[PDB]
Structure 1
Amino acid sequence: ASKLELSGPAEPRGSKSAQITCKAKGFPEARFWVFWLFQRAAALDWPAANFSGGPVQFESRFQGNASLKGSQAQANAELNIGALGSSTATYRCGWKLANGGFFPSWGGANVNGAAGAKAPAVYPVEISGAGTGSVTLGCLVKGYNAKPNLTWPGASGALTFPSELNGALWNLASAVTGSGFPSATCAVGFGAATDVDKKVAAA
């Protein structure tokens, strides 16, 4: 079947150059235009398209920023991205039906144009001296540059909010609606050797 396998996530630094690949398989790559997309937490943009046995056609916004290449001896469709800073997005590699103009099969690879690599800081945000029935506890994770996995010890009432940029690092919050409070701890899931778990005290 037609499929396009894309490279893993890349982390360029400010103004580096990033080359994304699609190992297209299941179809003659030289017969179809292989496209690229661009989704930065929004709707889908359109960088360019590349005919693997010929011309490359760009959008006027991406002329000089994107550069599409096609290796027909490896059935590989590649996108080289130049100057960066706001190109942190997800790039797709959808091929095209030779007649219509729509995209039947797609890919997907993330690009994160940021700088730094830091260990997260865990703060046990708690109540301010009040209580009525069920009470809300929390946990603030501040100052990291990867994807964490916040967990709680066997309690399923948690809401882990999506992270946001604060300068060049990421901030995340978690909340739990616990009725009784004998003992609760916040455990984070930062894969880069930072597995700090901290309890939540009173006041």
Structure 2
Amino acid sequence: ASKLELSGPAEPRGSKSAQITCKAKGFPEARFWVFWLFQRAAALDWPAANFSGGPVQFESRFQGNASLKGSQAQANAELNIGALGSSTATYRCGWKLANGGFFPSWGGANVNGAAGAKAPAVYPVEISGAGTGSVTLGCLVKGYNAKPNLTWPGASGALTFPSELNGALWNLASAVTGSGFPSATCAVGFGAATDVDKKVAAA
């Protein structure tokens, strides 16, 4: 079966050069074009395509920013990215069928164009005070540069929001709708060893 495998996530700093590999198994790489695609949590763009036995085509937007190479001794297609700033996205690699012009198989790699790596700060936001039915608590995680996994001790009613960019760091919120409040704590974990857990008090 045809399958392409891509490299792991990369975190370049500002305008560094990032190389993404795409290995291909199950078909001769020299017979079919390899296309690269761009997805910044939105619709898809087409950067470029490379034929493993000759010419390489680029879209005019990515001319000078992207560089495509193909090693046919290992069937690996490499995409080199130069200047950055808004290129933090998902770069997909997929082989074009040599008959029509569409893409049967797809891969996918992640690129985060940011700077810095700091420990998150946890704040257990609570209700200032009111009485209406069940209560809703909160937990704010601010100031990090990785992917966390906020959890709660055995309670499944939680909503953990997608993280948003603030400055050069990431901010995340979590909400819990609890009926009774004997004791609750917010536990989070950082990409790095960084990880703590803070209880939620009143007022």
Q: Output the TM-score relative to the length of structure 2.
A: 0.99
Which stretches in structure 2 are left out of the alignment for 5+ residues? none
Superposed CA RMSD in Å reads: 0.5
Q: 2 CA distance for matches of 1:189 and 1:43? A: 31
Q: 2 CA distance for matches of 1:54 and 1:122? A: 54
Which stretches in structure 1 are left out of the alignment for 5+ residues? none
Q: 2 CA distance for matches of 1:175 and 1:194? A: 22
**1:133 to partner: Cα distance:** 1.5
**1:132 to partner: Cα distance:** 1.6
Counterpart secondary structure, 2:37: coil
**1:129 to partner: Cα distance:** 1.0
**What fraction of aligned residue pairs are identical, expressed as a percent?**
100
Task: State the Cα deviation string for residues 63-93 of structure 1 (Å, max 9, x = none).
Answer: 0000010000000011000001110000000
When you count strand as a share of all residues, which structure comes out higher?
2
Q: 2 CA distance for matches of 1:5 and 1:102? A: 19
Task: State the Cα deviation string for residues 82-118 of structure 1 (Å, max 9, x = none).
Answer: 0011100000001001110000000000000000000
Task: State the Cα deviation string for residues 154-185 of structure 1 (Å, max 9, x = none).
Answer: 00000000000000000000000000000000
Task: Name the counterpart of 1:96.
Answer: 96
Q: 2 CA distance for matches of 1:78 and 1:131? A: 60
Counterpart secondary structure, 1:13: coil
Task: Name the counterpart of 2:41.
Answer: 41
Task: State the Cα deviation string for residues 131-153 of structure 1 (Å, max 9, x = none).
Answer: 22211000000000000000000
Q: 2 CA distance for matches of 1:67 and 1:154? A: 49
**1:191 to partner: Cα distance:** 3.1
Task: Name the counterpart of 1:155.
Answer: 155
Q: 1 CA distance for matches of 2:137 and 2:131? A: 11
**1:201 to partner: Cα distance:** 0.3
Counterpart secondary structure, 1:31: coil
Task: Name the counterpart of 1:173.
Answer: 173
Q: 2 CA distance for matches of 1:12 and 1:169? A: 15
Task: State the Cα deviation string for residues 34-79 of structure 1 (Å, max 9, x = none).
Answer: 0100001110000000000000000000000000100000000110
Using the TM superposition, name which of 128-137 and 19-28 deviates more.
Answer: 128-137
Counterpart secondary structure, 1:24: strand
Query: Does residue 199 of the first structure (1) align with residue 199 of the second (2)?
Result: yes
Counterpart secondary structure, 2:49: strand
Q: Output the TM-score relative to the length of structure 1.
A: 0.99
Moved over 3 A (4+): none
Q: 2 CA distance for matches of 1:49 and 1:194? A: 41
